Amino acid sequence: LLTVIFVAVGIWGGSLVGVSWKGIDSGFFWSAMQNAVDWRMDLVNCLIKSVV
Amino acid sequence: LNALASLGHKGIKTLRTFGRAGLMLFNALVGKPEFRKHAPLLVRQLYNVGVLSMLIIVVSGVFIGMVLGLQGYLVLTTYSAETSLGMLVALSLLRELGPVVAALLFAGRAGSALTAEIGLMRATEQLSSMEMMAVDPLRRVISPRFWAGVISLPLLTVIFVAVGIWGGSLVGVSWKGIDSGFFWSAMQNAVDWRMDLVNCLIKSVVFAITVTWISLFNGYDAIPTSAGISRATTRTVVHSSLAVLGLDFVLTALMFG
Amino acid sequence: KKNEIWVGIFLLAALLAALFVCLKAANTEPTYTLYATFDNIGGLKARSPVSIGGVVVGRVADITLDPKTYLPRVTLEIEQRYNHIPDTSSLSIRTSGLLGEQYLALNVGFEDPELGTAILKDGDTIQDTKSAMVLEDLIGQFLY
Amino acid sequence: KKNEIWVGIFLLAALLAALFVCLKAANTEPTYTLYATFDNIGGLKARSPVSIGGVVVGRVADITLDPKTYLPRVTLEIEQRYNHIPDTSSLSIRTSGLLGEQYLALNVGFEDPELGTAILKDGDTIQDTKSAMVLEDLIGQFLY
Amino acid sequence: KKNEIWVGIFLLAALLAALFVCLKAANTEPTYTLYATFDNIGGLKARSPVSIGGVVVGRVADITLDPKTYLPRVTLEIEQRYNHIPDTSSLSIRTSGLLGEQYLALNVGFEDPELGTAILKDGDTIQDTKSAMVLEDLIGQFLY
Amino acid sequence: KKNEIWVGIFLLAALLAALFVCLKAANTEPTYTLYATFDNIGGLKARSPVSIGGVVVGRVADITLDPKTYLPRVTLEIEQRYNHIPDTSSLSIRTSGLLGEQYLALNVGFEDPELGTAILKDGDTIQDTKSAMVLEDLIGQFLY
Numbered sequence A: 001l002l003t004v005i006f007v008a009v010g011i012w013g014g015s016l017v018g019v020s021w022k023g024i025d026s027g028f029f030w031s032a033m034q035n036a037v038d039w040r041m042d043l044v045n046c047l048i049k050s051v052v
Numbered sequence B: 001l002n003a004l005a006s007l008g009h010k011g012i013k014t015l016r017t018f019g020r021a022g023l024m025l026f027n028a029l030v031g032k033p034e035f036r037k038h039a040p041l042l043v044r045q046l047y048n049v050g051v052l053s054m055l056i057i058v059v060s061g062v063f064i065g066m067v068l069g070l071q072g073y074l075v076l077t078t079y080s081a082e083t084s085l086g087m088l089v090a091l092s093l094l095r096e097l098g099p100v101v102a103a104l105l106f107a108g109r110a111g112s113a114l115t116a117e118i119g120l121m122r123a124t125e126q127l128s129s130m131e132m133m134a135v136d137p138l139r140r141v142i143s144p145r146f147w148a149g150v151i152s153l154p155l156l157t158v159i160f161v162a163v164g165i166w167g168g169s170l171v172g173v174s175w176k177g178i179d180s181g182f183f184w185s186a187m188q189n190a191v192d193w194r195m196d197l198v199n200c201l202i203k204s205v206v207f208a209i210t211v212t213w214i215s216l217f218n219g220y221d222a223i224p225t226s227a228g229i230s231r232a233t234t235r236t237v238v239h240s241s242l243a244v245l246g247l248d249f250v251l252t253a254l255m256f257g
Numbered sequence C, D, E, F: 001k002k003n004e005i006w007v008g009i010f011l012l013a014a015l016l017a018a019l020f021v022c023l024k025a026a027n028t029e030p031t032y033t034l035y036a037t038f039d040n041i042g043g044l045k046a047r048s049p050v051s052i053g054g055v056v057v058g059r060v061a062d063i064t065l066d067p068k069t070y071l072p073r074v075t076l077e078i079e080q081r082y083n084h085i086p087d088t089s090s091l092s093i094r095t096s097g098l099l100g101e102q103y104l105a106l107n108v109g110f111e112d113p114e115l116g117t118a119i120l121k122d123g124d125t126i127q128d129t130k131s132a133m134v135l136e137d138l139i140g141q142f143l144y
Helices: A004-021 A027-033 A039-051 B004-028 B040-051 B054-077 B084-123 B128-132 B135-150 B153-176 B180-188 B192-218 B226-254 C002-025 C136-144 D001-023 D135-143 E007-024 E137-144 F002-024
Strands: C031-037 C049-052 C055-059 C073-079 C104-108 D048-050 D055-060 D104-108 E031-037 E049-052 E057-058 E073-079 E104-110 F030-036 F049-052 F055-060 F073-079 F103-108
Touching: A004 A027, A004 C002, A027 C002, A039 C002, B004 B135, B004 B192, B004 D001, B004 E007, B040 B084, B040 B135, B040 B153, B040 F002, B054 B084, B054 B153, B084 B128, B084 B135, B084 B153, B084 B180, B084 B192, B084 B226, B084 E057, B128 B135, B135 B153, B135 B192, B153 B180, B153 F002, B192 B226, B226 E007, C104 C136, C136 D135, D001 E031, D001 E104, D135 E137, F049 F073
Parallel strands: C049 C104, D048 D104, E049 E104, F049 F103
Antiparallel strands: C031 C073, C049 C055, C055 C073, D048 D055, E031 E073, E049 E057, E057 E073, F030 F073, F049 F055, F055 F073
């Protein structure tokens, strides 16, 4: 529960400086991120590295 | 409000510690630039903070290069560019992880254990008896330790990047089937000297000024009982760890803005 | 009673963060397979577009040669709601350019025989191959 | 104390100063949908440019097959100030390069019929199609 | 202790003065406006290089079709010290690559008339459009 | 005595590591300049290979236009030992492929005139250019 708060507030700050300040459309940024990562070997895989 | 007066004590209190940090350090590096005494005195301190901190850097340095060479190998193959590995881990180490991770572990080993030796030396009143010896300890015991940091950590980074980049050249070249002459070749024309190579030092040498100062200050105003000193050690690790990332975000804005 | 409050915020702050990262990173259907034996499959990997007329309706989740007859035995992923496709079918490999994916763009008619309409579903081996593109040798011989 | 609230609100005013500078930095538009049946959209993904003569006028959203006639129905995103466009239009998919983005570049014309002009606003399904070019078939029949 | 009350505020002043320098050079000169009517801007995005002889002289900051004549009206950003340019010019889009950026590289010469040298500043609408890069009509031309 | 040795190991091991990053991981020649006024440099960035017959002999250390005559003046980077260049030369920009890198491939010979052999070193200006290499000719010569 310390990692899932870390990745979320980590990825929100990444969405600031690229989108807002360095002139990128907001709807385009999440769009490449939507089909980027899967659940089975990425999303639960973050927990397996963290819980061990 | 009744609760806003509890903040009125803190807003004065937390600023007076900043006044103590400047006033201690300013007295530490002024007057009598003696070199006959300090030159054997300082070199014993580099055995404390340089040699004992050397082993943890290299055995962790091979693990970062082997991971980035492994994880980076998937991202290049999905974009079908083998040669980019040499200009990736060289790029990533020499400007991002080199100054940031080595300063973290230096705050880990040498950052904490320096603060323990200071507060213990006031706890048994070796400090308070040295004033009866009429020797000012801030030039005598602090400044041998303070220069022992800022000289060390640049030499702790250049050993880190080198053994880091050597392990990166193992798993990509040898194990994951890439020609050896091709790997260094993309790395040769990859990075320049003026805004990359000296730039690694600028990020590292400004970290050593903060971490050594933030460590040796917490030993100087800690509560000398055995409870307050270990509280001060875990206050040193958490305060340096914000200051390394509180500086690096600023120091990555100027170089790449 | 101060400590019981902050943990309740923390597990909520853990839950608020968890739902946000899950919805952003994670944005399925039961199907049947259909066997297909070809003559050329070169350039087509797995999960390539399986399309009727041009719009993708399926996936190739097989990729494997039948190791007794040396006919390339390919099974597709046609959606389970497809129960009215007759036997009149022609399987053709298209590229959508000179290099798109060299995907599958098959053709199916509605031409009914005088012996009942046989259906293609749940493990049928459709037989009208393309003997697909020989594209390098096609460019080579025309260029002479 | 007197030094408390005068400094604490000073840390609060600057907290809302840059936060108001955070939202005001980098500053969506109500539109209407336009349904479109096609023949080939392979390569045209979501949020691809819609352009009238080249200038981008909207985005391609909503991409899914109409699962009863198997003609690809896609609704577009056209702004509500577009209220004087006659029915005469061709719907072409261009690329602007050999592999640029495969964006929709539809044609318009002000050819007024003598039976009245039909307006294209708020859900007018178009019936005109490019049948987007298959470059495999272009060079293929060019050499036999 | 009256010291970092004085000194430490300058230390946070020394970083913000260092911070204000670098972000200023991370995102500047009084210019004038020059309108331009085109027919087609395919990959011509905002902030594209407006170049004279290849050397960039301005940016595009206005990309809003004039919705009454349906010619793409684009206002350029030509600096205020550009006061010696005669009216003989041509407006063309090159790319610097097969797909580089699709940038405006407008040509200009000193072909002075015998009626007087017209100037281009503070809001002139040049009418010398190119209408060249479509790359789909040209591949359609040869096949015929 | 045990600590005075181990510090010397620590200081020496940082010295071998210091060479390893600058000699193996990152690695030039004093030259003379040569002026060259062109007519089209669209696509040629600095440090592009300045070559004789294709073999590189220099790099571009000048992308600037002189702001008085509007002929792009580049100063070349030709090495000091090049001492027997006759003035007979032609200057042309090539590409090394369809889109390789837009490099300068200048022509030279040994064609001695009967008025001496004028040398080309230490800042001469060559009066030759090749403003034809554009991405607009091939779309105007394959079709007109």
